[PDB]
Design a protein around this nucleic acid. Structure first.
Ligand code: MG
Ligand code: MG
Ligand code: MG
Ligand code: MG
Ligand code: MG
Lengths: 84, 104, 177, 136
RNA sequence: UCCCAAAAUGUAACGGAGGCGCCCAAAGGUCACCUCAAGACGGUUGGAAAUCGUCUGUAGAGCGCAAAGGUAGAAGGUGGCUUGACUGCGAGACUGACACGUCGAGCAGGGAGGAAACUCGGGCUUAGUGAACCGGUGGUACCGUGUGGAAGGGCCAUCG
RNA sequence: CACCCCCGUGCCCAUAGCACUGUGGAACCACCCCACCCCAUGCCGAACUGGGUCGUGAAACACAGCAGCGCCAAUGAUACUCGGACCGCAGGGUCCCGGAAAAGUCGGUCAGCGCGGGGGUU
């Protein structure tokens, strides 16, 4: 036993596995359920036939074609323009 | 404030529901109770109060709602979405609802 | 109980003093705010009811306790603890407490001469300062706990301090000469 | 010299001068022709050289500041971690960057104080004059 | 979690920084309502800040924590009513050598909020964890050594 | 979408915004008016909410002017760079070929486009 410290200060190991990003892109065919975006907050917000999971995951509600709408950052949307 | 209109107007999930929206202008005494189409930038039915108020101004309640409900069948409309602008759904606007909720 | 005495004497006089295009463009009194910024050095559960009950007899209104902004500064500062007592007066209840001031409040003050006239709230408003509690019509040392005071704010529809200054005095208000 | 508040450590990379005019503040300047890391002590060395030459007044503009922290080898090893916080502070200088500029002194007075300050620097320099009014 | 990381994903070092091993019965569900930090000028204990008032104010605040993303048409702040922090299931994807891990529309039984469209299978998200083996406990009545029971086991649940 | 204007509601969400300045009242909208209840304020009809005029168009709004500020923003040139090929012991640099900024300057803007209902051309 010493009077100094428990864990030694000034470290540099530590980091984490992690994934993320866009899964399906502008002009891709999607089946219903297909995840099209993995993200943190609401980088991209849901549109036509596009849902939003607990972890802001954007998925297809109904089959079709992925369409991206870029209004100017923040106002970003993914939609499904149903093929039929 | 102006945040209340945009609030209910945002919670009115347009195309997911399939239904048409029913707007109301009860801030003044010339209630505009309109049937507005989601997709097309169109207003279908509608019933005002300026064109003969029937003496009443706030009591014209059911009158504008009845006028609307009847005008809806004339077009076919049966499925609706009511949008209480900033109006706390209680008097003037609560009657217009039942007036249309019983007139079709 | 004062309404027409605001109109008939003050209202036409301001168009006969200045000259407004309409009866609506003439300055008006928006609201009267009464604030009791106690606590800090008076952190007691007993003192909470004290001024609040005393305020309920003068304004005829139940007062609200404006809690601290959760400011946990160096000195005696913490979470949302009771630090101020507020009551708003507008319309009917406003003129009941305003008349009570010019008649019993303002003259029946020990060491009285008049109130500060100098440029107050630059955008046509007034913020009165009271330095005692035993100078009110319904407040006496017989049925109390200790010795204190209060603060009062007068909100007006006046565009400038120039137009605000006239309205206050012509309603009946002391100015040190 | 050193900076007041920071992060502790840095890196390294280079390419032609980004933010260095010609005639701002002073009448005559001293421009870098080579890239380097200007040590706090080399600037101090140049300053004192110029200040001494221009005895009284004080019209020396040091347009460069040492902000980059550099590290060191305690004595041996490698069987340990990242090192030496407190070695020395540096200013990343790229060719074109005005390091110093003088005022209220003649062409001849300035020619010399810069000729002197040049001998204390780890790079080749050039003495300059006016005719640069880019954006103000 | 950020940086390294070379504008997809991924990527090492005894490289540079910093957190987690829980918490919340509301800090959950839903329906209502509210809108921040700061500064100037004016005022009771006061007076550097405080409680009040007007004027500026994408947000310079907040979000139980670390940081990043996100966010005021709220994810911030306040209240009513509540227990979906449900049981049986999973079209289809994300992610990993596996074993794990993530997201999820839709169907049934039953509910909660709301007039209603609707929303609800915990929390703005990304940490708050531990295979298997042996075993404690509530349920179940599958096996049970000739038969009928029983001991013991199996099976749901869950604790170490 | 004969034409003017107004009240609602869209697409578009700064070339749509702010400031300054001017016009509009009894059509529409705004304050206003009173409130014991329906309903509402951790206090106050401020806001919600109810009954209604008058009075005014002050405030708000709508519309119009304007280029002071915001916002938008070239051409040229450079930075940087895919591929080809080199220089320097090095930090670092060059040539050929396409690609191509950011900032700045010229300048451009006080939007454009729908649907419904109300009131005017005495
Ligand atoms: Mg620009
Ligand atoms: Mg090529
Ligand atoms: Mg190359
Ligand atoms: Mg070589
Ligand atoms: Mg080229």
């Amino acid at each position: 036993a010493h009077k100094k410290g428990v864990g030694s200060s000034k470290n540099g190991r530590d980091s984490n596995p992690k994934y993320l990003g866009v899964k399906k892109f502008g002009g891709e065919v999607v089946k219903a359920g297909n995840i099209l975006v993995r993200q943190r907050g609401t980088k991209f917000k849901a549109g036509q036939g596009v849902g939003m999971g607990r972890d802001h995951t954007l998925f297809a509600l109904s089959d079709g074609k992925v369409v991206f709408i870029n209004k100017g950052k923040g106002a970003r949307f993914i939609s499904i323009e149903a093929a039929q | 404030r102006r945040k209340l209109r945009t609030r209910r107007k945002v919670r009115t999930t347009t195309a997911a529901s399939g239904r048409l929206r029913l707007s109301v202008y009860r801030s003044s005494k010339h209630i505009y109770a309109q049937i507005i189409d989601d997709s097309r930038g169109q207003t279908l039915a509608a019933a005002s109060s300026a064109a003969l108020k029937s003496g009443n101004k706030t009591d014209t309640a059911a009158a504008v709602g009845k006028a609307l409900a009847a005008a809806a069948a004339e077009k076919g409309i049966k499925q609706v979405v009511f949008d209480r602008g900033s109006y706390k759904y209680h008097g003037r606007v609560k009657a217009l609802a039942d007036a249309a909720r019983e007139g079709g | 109980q004062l309404k027409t005495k605001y109109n008939d004497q003050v209202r036409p006089a301001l168009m006969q003093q200045f000259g407004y295009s309409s009866v609506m463009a003439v300055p008006r009194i928006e609201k009267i705010v009464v604030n009791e910024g106690l606590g800090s050095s008076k952190e007691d559960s007993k003192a909470i009811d004290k001024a609040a009950k005393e305020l309920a007899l003068i304004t005829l209104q139940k007062p609200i306790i404006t809690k601290a902004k959760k400011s946990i500064s160096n000195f005696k500062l913490r979470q949302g603890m009771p630090v101020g007592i507020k009551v708003t007066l507008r319309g009917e209840r406003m003129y009941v407490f305003l008349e009570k001031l010019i008649n019993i409040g303002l003259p029946r003050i020990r060491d009285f001469r008049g109130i500060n006239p100098n440029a107050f709230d630059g955008r046509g408003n007034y913020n009165l300062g009271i330095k005692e509690q035993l100078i009110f019509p319904e407040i006496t040392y017989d049925m109390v706990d200790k010795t204190r005071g209060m603060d009062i704010t007068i909100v007006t529809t006046a565009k400038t301090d120039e137009e605000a200054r006239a309205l206050l005095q012509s309603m009946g208000l002391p100015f040190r000469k | 010299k050193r900076t007041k508040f920071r992060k502790q450590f840095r890196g390294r990379m280079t390419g032609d001068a980004k933010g260095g005019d010609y005639v701002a503040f002073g009448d005559y300047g001293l421009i870098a022709m080579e890239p380097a890391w200007i040590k706090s002590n080399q600037i101090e060395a140049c300053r004192i050289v110029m200040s001494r030459h221009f005895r009284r007044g004080g019209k020396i503009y040091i347009r460069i500041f040492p902000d980059k922290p550099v590290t060191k080898k305690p004595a041996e090893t490698r069987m340990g971690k990242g090192k030496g916080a407190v070695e020395y502070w540096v200013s990343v200088v790229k060719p074109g960057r005005v390091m110093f500029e003088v005022a209220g002194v003649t062409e001849e007075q300035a020619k010399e104080a810069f000729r002197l300050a040049g001998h204390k620097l780890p790079i080749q320099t050039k003495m300059v004059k006016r005719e640069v009014y880019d954006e103000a």
